[PDB]
Scaffold this motif. Structure first.
Motif, PDB file in Angstrom:
ATOM      1  N   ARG A   1     -23.030  -7.850  49.803  1.00 33.67           N
ATOM      2  CA  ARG A   1     -21.855  -8.849  49.221  1.00 33.67           C
ATOM      3  C   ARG A   1     -22.506  -9.529  48.006  1.00 33.67           C
ATOM      4  NH1 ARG A   1     -17.733 -11.105  51.671  1.00 33.67           N
ATOM      5  NH2 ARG A   1     -17.960 -10.483  53.878  1.00 33.67           N
TER       6      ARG A   1
ATOM      7  N   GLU B   1     -19.956 -14.156  44.687  1.00 36.35           N
ATOM      8  CA  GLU B   1     -18.688 -15.014  44.844  1.00 36.35           C
ATOM      9  C   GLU B   1     -18.376 -15.051  46.164  1.00 36.35           C
ATOM     10  N   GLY B   2     -18.350 -13.553  46.779  1.00 36.26           N
ATOM     11  CA  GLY B   2     -18.224 -13.522  48.026  1.00 36.26           C
ATOM     12  C   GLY B   2     -18.867 -14.093  49.146  1.00 36.26           C
TER      13      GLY B   2
ATOM     14  N   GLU C   1     -17.891 -17.825  49.036  1.00 27.93           N
ATOM     15  CA  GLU C   1     -16.454 -17.981  50.165  1.00 27.93           C
ATOM     16  C   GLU C   1     -16.963 -17.890  51.453  1.00 27.93           C
ATOM     17  N   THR C   2     -17.817 -16.941  51.806  1.00 26.35           N
ATOM     18  CA  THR C   2     -18.062 -16.849  53.379  1.00 26.35           C
ATOM     19  C   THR C   2     -18.913 -17.608  53.824  1.00 26.35           C
ATOM     20  OG1 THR C   2     -17.872 -14.335  52.767  1.00 26.35           O
ATOM     21  CG2 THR C   2     -19.085 -14.958  54.932  1.00 26.35           C
TER      22      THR C   2
ATOM     23  N   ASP D   1     -17.448 -13.545  58.280  1.00 28.85           N
ATOM     24  CA  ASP D   1     -18.120 -12.572  57.755  1.00 28.85           C
ATOM     25  C   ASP D   1     -17.634 -11.280  58.389  1.00 28.85           C
ATOM     26  OD1 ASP D   1     -19.454 -10.623  56.467  1.00 28.85           O
ATOM     27  OD2 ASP D   1     -21.449 -11.442  57.119  1.00 28.85           O
TER      28      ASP D   1
ATOM     29  N   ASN E   1     -18.109  -7.932  57.361  1.00 22.61           N
ATOM     30  CA  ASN E   1     -18.982  -7.051  56.685  1.00 22.61           C
ATOM     31  C   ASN E   1     -19.797  -6.318  57.906  1.00 22.61           C
ATOM     32  OD1 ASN E   1     -17.749  -7.349  54.016  1.00 22.61           O
ATOM     33  ND2 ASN E   1     -19.743  -7.493  53.277  1.00 22.61           N
TER      34      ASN E   1
END
Ligand SMILES: CC(C)(C)OC(=O)N[C@H]1CCCCC/C=C\[C@@H]2C[C@@]2(C(=O)NS(=O)(=O)C2CC2)NC(=O)[C@@H]2C[C@@H](OC(=O)n3cc4cccc(F)c4c3)CN2C1=O
Ligand SMILES: [Zn+2]
Length: 198
Positions: free
Chosen positions: A30, A33-34, A37-38, A44, A46
């Motif tokens: 990740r 930016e991700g 946000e997370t 999450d 992922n």
């Protein structure tokens, strides 16, 4: 005052140290930016793999290591933060400021290291750059680097593992002992201290 008080974000898994093959290497899963946000949502989705995760908050990045179904890291990185997970933020299951230790239930998909019962003093430290650094155990919670390195090379690797020759977990990297910016030794939370916490 009260209505505008913010909440700290979650710790977020942003990558891993791949130890599955003949070559150790860092993988990012990740981007920044991700990650931001997370951390805010705590959600999450992922896929997680492996034993050693690279984790981040808004302000710091470090490592976390799965041992016996718990993802462990350092309090000086995580504080009391939740970890982001597919179903939302997950509260710590262990917090011990005196040991500089925290833990959460290991994420689905992670693999756990087995605690060492070898009593071997020939150890290996895994860093966030996937360096595998030989370390001679020098006490319950201390080891010396066979080849000293500037502290810069170790920064961001707290929460990573010290392993025995058979790949068992011996401890969690906590502090570097440095003289004039050069790390000659490391201190770690021994796996027995984790096992007692459990
Ligand atoms: C103890 C002794 C002998 C005096 O030495 C040192 O205090 N040395 C320093 C040398 C710092 C220079 C960089 C060294 C490079 C890598 C270091 C591994 C590392 C790291 O990578 N963190 S991080 O970037 O991932 C970070 C993002 C997570 N940890 C640190 O910096 C820690 C953090 C800080 O310690 C603590 O807040 N506590 C709170 C504790 C509570 C209980 C018990 C403890 F022990 C505790 C240790 C000082 N630290 C050292 O190591
Ligand atoms: Zn072992």
């Amino acid at each position: 005052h009260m209505a505008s008080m913010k909440k700290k974000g979650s710790v977020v898994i942003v990558g891993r140290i791949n130890l599955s093959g003949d070559t150790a290497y860092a993988q990012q899963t990740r981007g920044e930016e991700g990650c931001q946000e997370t951390s805010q949502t705590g959600r999450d989705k992922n896929q997680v793999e492996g034993e050693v995760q690279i984790v981040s908050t808004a302000t710091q990045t470090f490592l976390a290591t799965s041992i016996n179904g718990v993802l462990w890291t350092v309090y000086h990185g995580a504080g009391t933060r939740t970890i982001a997970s597919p179903k939302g933020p997950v509260t710590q299951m262990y917090t011990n400021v005196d040991k500089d230790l925290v833990g959460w239930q290991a994420p689905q998909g992670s693999r756990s290291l087995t605690p060492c019962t070898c009593g071997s003093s020939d150890l290996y430290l895994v860093t966030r750059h996937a360096d595998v650094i030989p370390v001679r155990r020098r006490g319950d919670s201390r080891g010396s680097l066979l080849s000293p390195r500037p502290i810069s090379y170790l920064k961001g690797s707290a929460g990573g593992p010290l392993l025995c020759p058979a790949g068992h977990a011996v401890g969690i990297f906590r502090t570097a002992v440095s003289t004039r910016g050069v790390a000659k030794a490391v201190d770690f939370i021994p796996v027995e201290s984790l096992e007692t916490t459990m």
